[PDB]
Structure formats: structure tokens, C-alpha cells
Enzyme design. Structure first.
Site, PDB file in Angstrom:
ATOM      1  N   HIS A   3     -24.175 -19.264  18.715  1.00 42.75           N
ATOM      2  CA  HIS A   3     -23.389 -18.029  18.691  1.00 42.75           C
ATOM      3  C   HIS A   3     -23.993 -16.892  19.501  1.00 42.75           C
ATOM      4  O   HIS A   3     -23.296 -15.964  19.917  1.00 42.75           O
ATOM      5  CB  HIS A   3     -23.119 -17.603  17.256  1.00 42.75           C
ATOM      6  CG  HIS A   3     -22.178 -18.531  16.540  1.00 42.75           C
ATOM      7  ND1 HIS A   3     -20.836 -18.255  16.374  1.00 42.75           N
ATOM      8  CD2 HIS A   3     -22.385 -19.752  15.987  1.00 42.75           C
ATOM      9  CE1 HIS A   3     -20.264 -19.260  15.722  1.00 42.75           C
ATOM     10  NE2 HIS A   3     -21.182 -20.183  15.482  1.00 42.75           N
ATOM     11  N   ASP A  36     -25.247  -9.352  23.977  1.00 42.20           N
ATOM     12  CA  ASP A  36     -24.390  -9.884  22.893  1.00 42.20           C
ATOM     13  C   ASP A  36     -23.798 -11.266  23.228  1.00 42.20           C
ATOM     14  O   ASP A  36     -23.144 -11.431  24.273  1.00 42.20           O
ATOM     15  CB  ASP A  36     -23.240  -8.909  22.588  1.00 42.20           C
ATOM     16  CG  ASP A  36     -22.944  -8.779  21.082  1.00 42.20           C
ATOM     17  OD1 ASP A  36     -23.077  -9.774  20.312  1.00 42.20           O
ATOM     18  OD2 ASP A  36     -22.592  -7.697  20.582  1.00 42.20           O
TER      19      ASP A  36
END
Ligand SMILES: O=c1ccn([C@@H]2O[C@H](COP(=O)(O)OP(=O)(O)O[C@H]3O[C@H](CO)[C@@H](O)[C@H](O)[C@H]3O)[C@@H](O)[C@H]2O)c(=O)[nH]1
Ligand SMILES: O=c1ccn([C@@H]2O[C@H](COP(=O)(O)OP(=O)(O)O[C@H]3O[C@H](CO)[C@@H](O)[C@H](O)[C@H]3O)[C@@H](O)[C@H]2O)c(=O)[nH]1
EC number: 2.4.1.15
Lengths: 452, 449, 449, 452
Positions: free
Chosen positions: B147, B354
Site C-alpha cells: 500500500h 504517499d
């Protein structure tokens, strides 16, 4: 006849503060001279800058960077200010600072001498100029000289920690008249003097130490009630008139001072936090605004208190804030005094809770600014000099944040009848001890001394 | 053909969770995962059954928690993978505990496994998990999805145990990443250590172990976002909608962590206030950020700094009737946040690094397509590869961020519409359902060893 | 005629403890006191008997501990009494708990009391104790000794609860202080609140309550200090005695707290190093300071600062073969510390405020009278009223402290002898035995109500 | 023929560092000019300060305070230095800094132009002067120009965060020759360039981008083995000779560098702590000395690392110290290089564990300084450029403090036979790639380019 006033700063013809109105009242009556630092650094070796209007003359000089640093930043603001406000933990005594402090006083005395006349009465203001009478005496000036201390004078157990305390007392006694904000300050001075040397006192206020005669007296500085009420009742600037209207069902709690550690600003924020925590019924219905322009920002302890305050504003608003409600408005900004009077008038609560304050004019200004027919409420620390006369205030101990919070709640809900009562009683005291009364008493007492 | 999913924390809604549930609803199967404390250290696993899904959970020791989750995962792996080697705090006892718990977790899952299962493992706490499964004889198709970013070699190879981590990852049959650059970074890391062979598109061999790699940028459920966003505000919230008729709102919400670049954001808003005085009294920046992971070394030194900066900035630029910056360190319901997105004129999403950033996609799915706000997005957010119509910025350049903010605040309805419709089409095409289905379909295609 | 002593922490040696034991050995009696944790919250008191002394101890709750000891006593009373109002953290729940535990402690002592007892209460945790005893009918002679300073009114009156504290203290029959100025400060505080009558030397009335005040400066046991100091060093310690033949040692040991002015001390040594370069390579300053009371608000921000300052000062003035400053954050046996005193050329005792400071007296009792070191002592230490032959300094004037240090390091044997012999005569005359006997004799003389 | 070298600082005739010996070797061979900043602020508008000895000329200029702040303190040291050392978290990009950086480069180019001759070869050093070739080209200089980067060149994922990265790459390609410390730096540069624009490469090291031709090459900077061994074998100053003797049964672990966050000094202290904690048998028998003069003290990140290091010294010594044993000696002081060579020779362990270092000359100096018959041990971070050639060192990962501690223990107990082996193998590598070899390769390659 002629009055000479010197202070660290001076106010020439063209925003008149509390002390300035007093000095100018005195000077206008006697005629004379106001002499002091221009507020500028560099280019010291230019002639004195002089202005003359009617009977008064204004005179100023620049100071070198070194002199400013040792005299004003170091000794005045990092030794005398913290000590006289009971913060030994903050004083930064170093010998060069003390030498600079004497140097600038001697410098000022040298600049001032040619401007003097035999019959002048001389009035010196504040802790920057403790040695100034002494410097004058050693230059052959026999004139009546009075001093006024605008801040507290600390007890012996604190005063006597200053490595240079004894020299300070010796030199203070070269004044013919020494004026203080409260009886406890005057007593504390005499207490420190008595611990060091034999003092002979007659009728409480007339003294001899080391063969030097001097008087002491209390003159609590005040306000101009007629001027404040005029300023306060005048229309707000358009943008602020708009805001007043938008706040109809919002109670405003308001504070203003220099951003100083003497003022207990973090402790005040903590009390506001306590109000929000334990009185949730005020949520969304009140605001606390704190105006706190930076003061003496070159001094580490002042940067430290400012950083602490920024953090607490962010934390409190971060915790009690809502999407459409900011609890605490913090402005690191200077506001004109005439405008502040208007803001005081529309504020429901004046919050003035210093840890130690010579007097605190903001507290007197706040109740002079009120509409007597619908007055707001003063919450006042018992450690402000003003608390001696403003006994009808909600008097509080800022070391007990829950007491201050309770007083804020009490203020926010006080009936009209009780607000009027408390206000009228305070206003009567401050109208009876005017800034005019304050300068008239000082000058009258000074004129009475028989010069050496 | 059963699906076994395992992930860190579970749920007997969200974003990843709708993807896992969607994948489980199609295949039937089991979701297997952890749940903090302890509640009971030595207790049987929680076997709760709906219809097609069977849900199983288990505890842990506070010693395992600290070395596993609080230490190696979050004090070595998380900072390293987000390009902050200066924040890694490697200690071998924590590496050991990291392996220990992976092996434990593997031990409890083994019995619950069936021969023809397909298995799907989520995220950096379980890099070693497929190796531990292979050590127990399971030959099933197992896929991994990462992720967070996968770092380039110059960063990854600093990890004292990088080479083990690399050997172990190659025991998965399929490795999924959020962007092409993460996929490439992994392959470059593996290539620096050992020879790898790519005989055909995205199909690899290393140390004789065969595996596939692919990009599956995690998505959103656009319909439900729009539904939630459109709903009636709570009363007190509709008291400031038409109170701010003439005030535009810039809005950010995220977790407090160093990767989000929150102080940098405040600095950018300051630069906007400083260089574009036209906006004074007429805009506001609202930042929501609930505290997170202040347990080990406490990134909470950032909470403190944000408090300071809100106080500083408001103190400088504020007025009696105008507070420039609203900083709220408070929890807000997802439903409400969707409505705030809709009523905010500018969405500010500027992390320093991110994996993806779902907030960027939520912000534009929540918009009224008739009158949408503008997304200002960091180029270092994985979402920036797809949300090409966003105002893309370099957060290291606070004046460029401010200029973007100025541009967003003045943007015409026509331009706001085409940018938003463009981003929205992309998020609808690659939704959370598409994402899970692509990963499952690829995982299914692999012939098991 | 029984003696009941109560004090905070007990002992089934030290300094105060030899005084309490000496007083108990003469009269016979009971020592009653607390002991941290809990071990057992609801348990019978510990009644352990030697011959004349009977020793009783008891526990507490962690809630009582925090409000009583951790909060009011040590976060309000201690900082206020040491002239640091800026460090007071008053909260009413802690004032309430302070009273609660005093009343509890009073409840357990009541049964153990006898009609003809004389009672002796120690220190600021028990200011309210005699009031709580009066509320239970005990009419015995009760004395109090305050170990720390009593602050002037301008400091004391800031305490939100100063007036209660004052009413309560007047329930003691006798109040003992370490210096005349503490005694006077108390009387001045009491005088500001209410009319007090002094009809005869040191005998007072306030609110109709009669009481006496007096000065008993706590002392030392000089013989045992000299005995311990003279003993053989542990081997590794006699490896640096004649390794430093040509290096003089300046020595301080104390608890870490804000009252000791430790950073100020480091600054003074720096000023010595800066302005007297003759001493480089030829002196050393050793500071021992074990951490203390880092439980509430943790004064431990001072540990951190000392670490920084040792690193800074050594980094600036150190050489490859010379470290100017030894800072040790470690526990040392009392016996060994007595020997270090003896072998140290200068004893540096410069607190910002101190009730008495026994270290100053130990340092000179430990000296070889044939070749003694020099005591540099703060004027703010209670010991300075008696140790008039010490080099007395104002620690707010770091250059004056440095000059004293320079003077101590160059002082002739003849002058070192007469200064030391002078201080020593004073400490032998007013020893710990004299102290306890004076307090007891005065307490005995009072006619009970 | 003539060589012109410019670098941020220059070394005129009358303490010769590593780079200086290389430059001077080149200049002495060709004859020519060394041009750069005097290290002085203020009075910029005085003529170039010039010295001439035999064939070499030295020339310097002062810089204004603003130029220094934006060029050197801000852009060079607070943007390029942190980024190129993989510390994005520390760069302080601001436009005025970037403009100042271009301004000073243009200024330097303007000062330099009249001093040039048509046949000059021009050698530019280091990250302060990335745009310098470009400034030269726009002023009509066609000469061969080479650049050497003394620090690492970061990968695209780090480099590309610099707002100004693209301009930096464009301008780098105006050099005819670009030299790097390691193969990974050169590859990283080409990788960043290839990500931005189409690059055509022949035989690994010959390129075209935007139609501009340039070569790349690796030249790992080195030492003068014969000079270091001479300096190192010379007598210690009397006071230090005394100390050596007093330390007979003490093993010395030694480190020296500028106090920079690239050097991993706190992490190193933590490893020493770990050695003390887990190998107590060394208590009282070893010492670790860290010499770390302040560098770039005007920059906040450098003040921050210094404060961190002071704290850790005090904490470690506070915890493991004894009355007659100080574990860690920290000196914030600069030591002469000739003296350091002597200190290296008497030190049992050289500890060089930077987090990122272009090369690190201290590591090469340490083993050149050893007595080959009784050599000490080098503990070296795998992240120093030097680790590519000093493979016989005890190579360690400073992110694993226990590994560094283990290597320290291993070094402290290594047999003579193994110390000799490891030392001789390292010494052979550094004697075969000399500072002479380093400048000769660079100059030889530069002379080969056909000028535009
Ligand atoms: O933004 C600002 C802030 C303050 N004020 C005015 O500044 C004055 C502040 O005076 P005061 O409230 O008395 O505080 P101080 O600044 O501390 O000045 C010192 O001097 C005053 C005169 O003696 C004494 O009352 C104080 O106790 C003494 O500390 C007041 O008239 C305020 O209205 C402004 O006009 N604008
Ligand atoms: O007190 C001191 C400290 C250091 N040195 C000398 O300073 C030099 C330090 O050079 P180096 O160890 O290489 O470190 P850097 O200061 O960082 O200089 C930069 O430039 C060097 C030349 O290319 C490269 O090896 C580095 O990796 C690069 O960061 C050495 O010769 C040391 O002996 C002194 O003489 N006195």
C-alpha cells in the site's frame, strides 16, 4: 518654575499614551523640556534633535548599538525588569551590561547638562534611569530632582540577589523625591534600604540615609476619564462597525497588553481552557480575544514567552474549536489606543490578570471606556497595582486557574444591576484619582523640597 | 475457488475494506487478521460467519506489538519506504520480533487453509509472510499488495536486512504495487542483489523463484461518496455554509505523520497570505488532523509544531473578525468529512510522499459536478499519476504551492468543471471494484507451483 | 516522657535520621511514617520493636501519592518555598488530596498516641498535621520542624490557600526553622493576615492560639564523617589520587532540582576557564547528580541541559589529554562520597536557595584538618549564616563565583587551615546531637493546653 | 597548455589539505591560475587580490553579505548539500536563494573572463559552481572546461525534488567533462538526465543531450602516501609525546571530520554506547576521541546537529563515566592536518562511519598514516565513497549500531597478522590511486576534448 522631564522615550507633537498625557499635562502647566532616547540606533554623533511648540521643547538623541544592547536590552530588560517582577530565574547579570547601564546614564546626563537652568525642577521616569540623579549630582546639579518608578519594587529577599543592589540603593537616595505605584513598593524600597544602612524616618515618608535627605510617596498612575469616554463612544471604523453587528449574540472577553511574561498570558489561556472545559454551555456563544504586540523581541525570555503563547493558542483552538467557531483569537499586533477604547466599550468582559504589574492602565481604561448605562465586567488579578483601588472588580488569583474561570463565568452572567454597581464604584475611584491628579501631586510634592 | 485475505486489522465503512469485501463476496472465503491490545493472549481465534465470508481474528503480546508493529514495521519499514532514512531506528531485537510474529501469524492461518485457496496478503507488516507459508508446505497462489511506496535502491539498500526482505518477497507468486515507479523500484532493488530474468511481460525469475509484478492503483467507491456528500449537514454545520457566502474554504484532512508535510503546508498558506493580500478576509484554510502513532518516538513533535504554527500564522495575519487558519486536532465522522469536501472550494492534498492518497479521490468524488472545487495535489502522491487534471505541485516549493492555491481560488466555473469531470471519469473507470477484480483475476491466472 | 516523631519516609545511616534516632534513644518512643508504592493499600501498620523505639509504617494509594506528595507538596509548596512562583502548578483537587492524606495519616496515628507523649512532626508535607490532631482531641505538646526555607509574604501570599496553611500552622505549640530569616518570614506572613501578640521573647498569640518559634539549624555528626572520610578508598579510586598529583579537584554532589542552580554552576566554571587560562590542564570540576523527582512535570529538563552543557564546555576547553568537566549522573555510596570530599581541593556548594545544605558541613567535617580543602558556598544556603569562614558567593554573579574558585585554588595552607578550623569548630558545637536536644528540651518546657 | 582552476576557496603559498595538494600538483605541471572566494565578507569593490610565484598565479575576491547568504549559506549549504546527501527533509528552497546562487556564479564568471587566454584548460570544482560552465559559454568562452563533483550525486527520486533540478541538468551539460567520485554518482547523474531528456551514449562515458556533447568519468580523490607517512612518523609536539606515553595500556579509537550531519556522528556515539553496554570488559581500557570542528555554523541544520552531539557526549559520559575514566572525549575544535597524521599513527582504531560521503579522505589518511609494521584498524561505513576501494576495512552499516559496536570490538582485539594483512591491502589500493594519479587523469582527459 520650568519642568524638565526625562524618560527612555518621548512623545513629540505628531498616538498619545497614558503616561504621555500626564507628562504633557505637567509640561503644559509649567512649560519646560522633555528629553530622552529617539528610539533609533546608529549615527549618535549628530546634534540633539529639538522641537519647540509654545512653551514645551522636545529633545532627543540616538544611541549606538552597543549602548542599546548593554543598557536597554541587557541591564534594563534582562536584569531589572525580571528581578523587579519577581523572576530571579530570568535575570542575566553580567558585568559589561552593568557598565553599559552606567555609561548610558552618564551619557544622558552629559547631553542634558547644558540644557538646564538653575530654577528647573527635574522629573525622571522609570527603572532605566535609577542612577540618573547621582550622575546629575556629580555634575554639580543641585536642583530638585524627583523619580517615579512605574513598576513594582521587590522585597529584600529578591532585590538583594542583584549583585549590584547596594550601588542601586545608594544612588536612589540622590533623588530628593521617590515615587511609587503602591504603598507596598515604597515599603519594599525602604525595607531594602534599611537592611543595608541605618535609615532615619520622620512621619513615614521623610528620610535620611548616609546623611542624604529624601522623601518617599505613592502616586498610583491613572487615566483621563473624559478623554477615554469620548474616544470610546465614537464610531468604530466601518469594518469594525460591521463586526460589532455580526456579534450580537456573542459575548466578548477581551484582553490587551504588551507580550510580556509579567502579564501571565499562558496562565490566562489555561483559565480560558478551564472555562471551556467546565462550563460547556458557553460553547459557540463566547469569544476571547487577546491582543499582544511583541515587546523587547531582542531579549531571549521575551521570544520564549511568545513561542509558549503561540503554542497554547493553537492547542486550545485545536481542542475546543469547531468548523464554524474559533474559541480564542490571538493577535500578535499593536492596536491604536483610541481604537482600543472603542473595543473595550463593546466587550462584555475585560480580562486583566498579570502575575505582577506596577499598576496596569488597561484595567482603568476598560472601565472608563464602558457605557455607564450598560457596562461590561472587569476580571482583575490581585497582583496588579490597580487592585488596590479597583476593589469592586472581580478580583482573582491567576495561580488558581479554576478561580479565574469561575470569575469569567460570573462576569458573563452578571445582572445589569450588579454590573452597574460594580462599574460605578470603580469609575468613581478612577475619576477621583486622575492622571491630572497624579501629575499635579507629583509636581506639587517636588516643588516643596528645599534644594541642596 | 476460495479467497483468503489477510491484513493487519480487520472488521466483523471505509475504502480498502470495500475492496476486500467485494473480492470475498464474489469468491466466498475468509478474512484473517489481527486486533490490538491484548484482550486475551492465549485464546482461540474468533470464527464469525456471515454466509460466504467466515472472518477470523486473534490477539498478541505487548512485547510482540512493540517489536513487530511499533518497532520494525513503523520505525524501520515505514520511514525507509517513505524516503526518510534519517528516521529509521533499526535494532535487531525488533527485526527478530518482526519475523517472529510473521511466523506466529502463519502458524494460526495454516490450519484454516484449504488446498484450492487463492491467498491475498496486505501491506508492509507482512513482507515475510509468503516465505513463512512456503516453509509450511503451502503451494497455493499467493499475491501481495503493497500500500505504501517501494523505495529506490539507494534508500532500500541502507536497510541492514534488505537482502533477506528481498529473498522473502520473491516467494509471493504475484506482487502488486500502487504505481509503475514502485514496481520498477522493487525490480531495481532485486536487480542490484541478484540476476533476474524477465522472459515475458512483467514475469520474472530470481534465484529460480518465479513471480509476476503489476500495478493496481487503489481506488474509491464513487457512488457512495457522492451519496454521503450530498446528504443534509448536521444543523450547526449548515450555520456556517451561508455565513461564509463570500469566504472560500481550502480544506485538508489527514493523519499526523512526517510523510504528509503538514508544517510545509502551513508555510505554503503563509506564503499565499504574504504574497496575495487580495485574499485577506475572504479565504480560510481548515486542517483536520487527528493524532496517530504517538506510541514509539512519538511523531507528535509535529502536533506541537502545528500548534505553534497555527498560533504564529493567525497571530500575524488574523484580524478581530477573521481567523486565517483553522487547525483542528479532532476526530470527524467519514460521512461529515464527505460533506465538508463538497462545500470546500479547494482540496489541498500535498504529502511529501504517499503510496496513493485516497483523500485526493474522495475530494473529487464528493463534489457537486455542477459546481466543483479544485484539487491541488502533490506530485509525490501516487494519485498524481492518474489525477493529471489536478493542480499538481512540488511541496518543496512553497511559492509554487501558493500560486496554485491562488489559481484554484480564481478559477472559472468552466475550467473547474472540465478539470473535475476529467479526474472523475478516471476515478469511476478505475474504482475500488475494478481494482480488486483486476488483482483477483491476475492472481487466479497463475499456475500454482 | 515518650517521644513520637513523624516524618515522611522512615528507616527500620544518614543525617536527620541520626537526630531522630538520638532523640528517640533518649526518651524512648515511636517513629511513625510513610513508605512508597503501594505494597498493600489496605493493610495493618508495620509495628517493629527494637527496645526503646517501636517503629510503625503504612502505605497509600497512587491517587493520594500524586495529589499529596507528587502534586501539592512538590508542585506547589516546594517551588513556592524556594522562591519559584513561576513553577507552582496549583490545582484544587491536589490541595484537597493534600488535606485528605494529612487527615488519613492523623487517623492511623491517633490510636498509637499516649496522653503524656511529646510529638515531633517533620517538614512541609505535614503543615496541616497538628490541626488534624487538634480536631481529634489531642492536647499533647506538638512541635514542627520545617526543613526548607519559609518564603516572605510577597511569595507565600500568592499561594491560593496561604491563609488556611497559616491558621493550621498555629496549632503547633512550637515551630522550628533553620534560620532567623525563615522564622521572621513566617511571622511576617502571619502578621499580614492577622494580629499577633508577642508578649515575651519568641512567644506568640494569633487568633487566641498560643505558640513558640525558634531557630534550630540542622547539623551533622562530625566524628563519623571524619571516620568514613579517612578510610581506605576502593582500589580503582586510589588509582587516580596520585595520578592527579598536579591536578586540583573542584567537587559538588547534589540532587537534580531547580533550587540547586546547576546550569549556573557550569556557567561559573566556564567563566573560570575563560578568564583564568593559568588553570588549564591543572584543575577539574566533578559534578555528581543523581536524577530525582522526574515524576511530575519532570525536572529532568535540567538533566538534559546539564548533558548539553558538559558536552559544550568540554568541547570548547578540552584537550586530547584533559577533560575540564566530569559530569556523572550516577548513584554513589555515602561512605565513598565522604572520601571524595577529603581528596577534593575545593567544595563547591552554590544552590540558588537551600533550607540548610548538609553537604557544605559534610565537606568540611571530612577534611584532613592538616591539609583541608576550601568551601565555596552560596549566600542563599542556610548554612552560610554559620559557615562564615567559607568563601561566600552570589551564584547570580558567575564572575564572582569564578574569582572565588580562583582564590580557593591558590589559597595558602595557613589560610586554608584557619578557615577550615573555624568552620569545623562551629559544626562540632552545633552538631546533630545538639540540634535534636535543643528542640526536645524546648518542646518539653511547653505547658500543654 | 595553461590550467585555470576555480573553486569556492583557494590556498595561496603561506596548512595544505587533500584537495589543495592535487590542484597545486596540476598547476605546477601546467602553470596557470587558481581563482576563487577569499573567504572574506564585505568590501567587494576592491581590485582582485593577486599573488604570483614562479608559474602559478592565485587570485581572490571578497563577496557581499547578501551574496554569501543566498549563494553559500542558503543555496549551496541549505539546498544542494542536504539534497545531494539524501536529506530532502533539510532543504530550504526559496527563490531568492536560487537567484543569489545564479548571481554569484555570473559575478565570478565576469571577474574571471579578462584573466583567460584562448588555449587555457579550465577546471571547476564542486556543487557551488554547477552553473559556472554555462555562465562561461554565454560570455563567449569555447575552451575545454571540466567539472569535478566532490560529493555524491543523488538518484532521480531525490534529485527531482529540487524545484530547479531541470535547469541544473541543462547547465551541467555545458561542461565538456564531468567527473565524479564513484560509478554510482556518475550513473545517478546520467539517470536524472535521461529522465528529463533524450541522451545518446557511446561507450558508456561519451554523451549528447540537447545536442550538447560531454563526457563523464570517475576519479576517486586520494592522498599523498609519501607525504602522509613522513608527517605521521615525525615527533609529536612535547605535550602530545607526553600523552602518548601516559596511554600505554589504553586503546584509542579515533575519529575526525567537520561537524556535519552527513557524517553520522550521533549514530556513531550510539554505537560507542552500545560497545560500552555490551562489551564491559573494555571499561577503563579504551577511549574514543571525536574531533569535530564546527562547519557552516550560520546554517540552522548545522547548529542543530552540533547541539545533538553535545547532548549525547554529556549523556554517554554521564552514564558510563567514572571518577577517573572518561569514555568519550569530544572536541569541537580544528586540528592541523600534519598533526592529525601523527595522531592517526598512535590510534588503534580509526572510526569513519558517515551516513553518506562523496569519498572521505580521512579514511585514506588513516591507513596511510599507519606504521606498516604495527598498523591500527579502519572501521568504515559502506556509505562512504572510499568503501568502493578500501574493501579490506571492517566495513559496517551505521544504521545497525550493534554491527558497528561488534566491529569496534573486533578491531580492538585483532591480531598483528590480520591487522598487517588488512592494512597492506588497503595501502596498496591508495598508493596505486594517488592524488597525483587523480589530477593527472583529470587533466589528461580534459586535454583530450576537442573544443567547440
Ligand atoms: O496594542 C496595544 C497595547 C497596549 N496599548 C496601551 O499600552 C498601555 C499599556 O500600559 P499598562 O497596561 O499599564 O502596561 P505596561 O506596558 O506594562 O507599562 C508599564 O507602565 C505603566 C505606567 O505606569 C504601568 O501601569 C505598568 O504596570 C508598567 O508595567 C495602555 O495604555 C494600553 O492601552 C496600546 O495602546 N496598544
Ligand atoms: O580538524 C580538522 C578536520 C578535518 N581535517 C581535514 O579535512 C579533510 C576532510 O576531508 P574529508 O574527510 O574528505 O571530508 P569532507 O570535509 O566532507 O570534504 C568533502 O570533500 C572531500 C574531497 O573530495 C570528499 O572526500 C568528501 O567525501 C566531501 O564531503 C581531511 O583531509 C582532514 O584531515 C583537518 O585537517 N582538520
Amino acid at each position: 518654575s520650568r519642568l524638565v522631564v526625562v524618560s527612555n522615550r518621548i512623545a513629540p507633537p505628531d498616538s498619545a499614551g497614558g503616561l504621555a498625557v500626564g507628562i504633557l499635562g505637567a509640561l503644559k502647566a509649567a512649560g519646560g523640556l522633555w528629553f530622552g532616547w529617539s528610539g533609533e540606533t546608529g549615527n549618535e554623533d549628530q546634534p540633539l534633535k529639538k522641537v519647540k511648540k509654545g512653551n514645551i521643547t522636545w529633545a532627543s538623541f540616538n544611541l549606538s548599538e552597543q549602548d542599546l544592547d548593554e543598557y536597554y536590552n541587557q541591564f534594563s530588560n534582562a536584569v531589572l525588569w525580571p528581578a523587579f517582577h519577581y523572576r530571579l530565574d530570568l535575570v542575566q547579570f553580567q558585568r559589561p551590561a552593568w557598565d553599559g547601564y552606567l555609561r548610558v546614564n552618564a551619557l544622558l546626563a552629559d547631553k542634558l547638562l547644558p540644557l538646564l537652568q538653575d530654577d528647573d525642577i527635574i522629573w525622571i521616569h522609570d527603572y532605566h534611569l535609577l542612577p540618573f540623579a547621582h550622575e546629575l549630582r556629580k555634575r554639580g546639579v543641585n536642583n530638585r530632582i524627583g523619580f517615579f518608578l512605574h513598576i513594582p519594587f521587590p522585597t529584600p529577599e529578591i532585590f538583594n540577589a542583584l549583585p549590584t543592589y547596594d550601588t542601586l540603593l545608594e544612588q536612589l537616595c540622590d533623588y530628593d523625591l521617590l515615587g511609587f505605584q503602591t504603598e507596598n513598593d515604597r515599603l519594599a524600597f525602604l525595607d531594602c534600604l534599611s537592611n543595608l544602612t541605618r535609615v532615619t524616618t520622620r512621619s513615614a515618608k521623610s528620610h535620611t540615609a548616609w546623611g542624604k535627605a529624601f522623601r518617599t510617596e505613592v502616586y498610583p498612575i491613572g487615566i483621563e476619564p473624559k478623554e477615554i469616554a469620548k474616544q470610546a463612544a465614537g464610531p468604530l471604523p466601518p469594518k469594525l462597525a460591521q463586526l460589532k453587528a455580526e456579534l450580537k449574540n456573542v459575548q466578548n472577553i477581551f484582553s490587551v497588553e504588551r507580550l510580556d511574561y509579567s502579564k501571565g498570558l499562558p496562565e490566562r489561556f489555561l483559565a480560558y481552557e478551564a472555562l471551556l472545559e467546565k462550563y460547556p454551555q458557553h460553547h459557540g456563544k463566547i469569544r476571547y480575544t487577546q491582543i499582544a504586540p511583541t515587546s523587547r523581541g531582542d531579549v531571549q525570555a521575551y521570544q520564549d514567552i511568545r513561542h509558549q503563547l503561540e503554542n497554547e493558542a493553537g492547542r486550545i483552538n485545536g481542542k475546543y474549536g469547531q468548523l464554524g467557531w474559533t474559541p480564542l483569537y490571538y493577535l500578535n499586533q499593536h492596536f491604536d489606543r483610541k481604537l482600543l477604547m472603542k473595543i473595550f466599550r463593546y466587550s462584555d468582559v475585560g480580562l486583566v490578570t498579570p502575575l505582577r504589574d506596577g499598576m496596569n492602565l488597561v484595567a482603568k481604561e476598560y472601565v472608563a471606556a464602558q457605557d455607564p448605562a450598560n457596562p461590561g465586567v472587569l476580571v482583575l488579578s490581585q497582583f496588579a497595582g490597580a487592585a488596590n483601588e479597583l476593589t469592586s472588580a472581580l478580583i482573582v488569583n491567576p495561580y488558581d486557574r479554576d478561580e479565574v474561570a469561575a470569575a469569567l463565568d460570573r462576569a458573563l452572567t452578571m445582572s445589569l444591576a450588579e454590573r452597574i454597581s460594580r462599574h460605578a464604584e470603580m469609575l468613581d475611584v478612577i475619576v477621583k484619582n486622575d492622571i491630572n491628579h497624579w501629575q499635579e501631586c507629583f509636581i506639587s510634592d517636588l516643588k516643596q523640597i528645599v534644594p541642596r
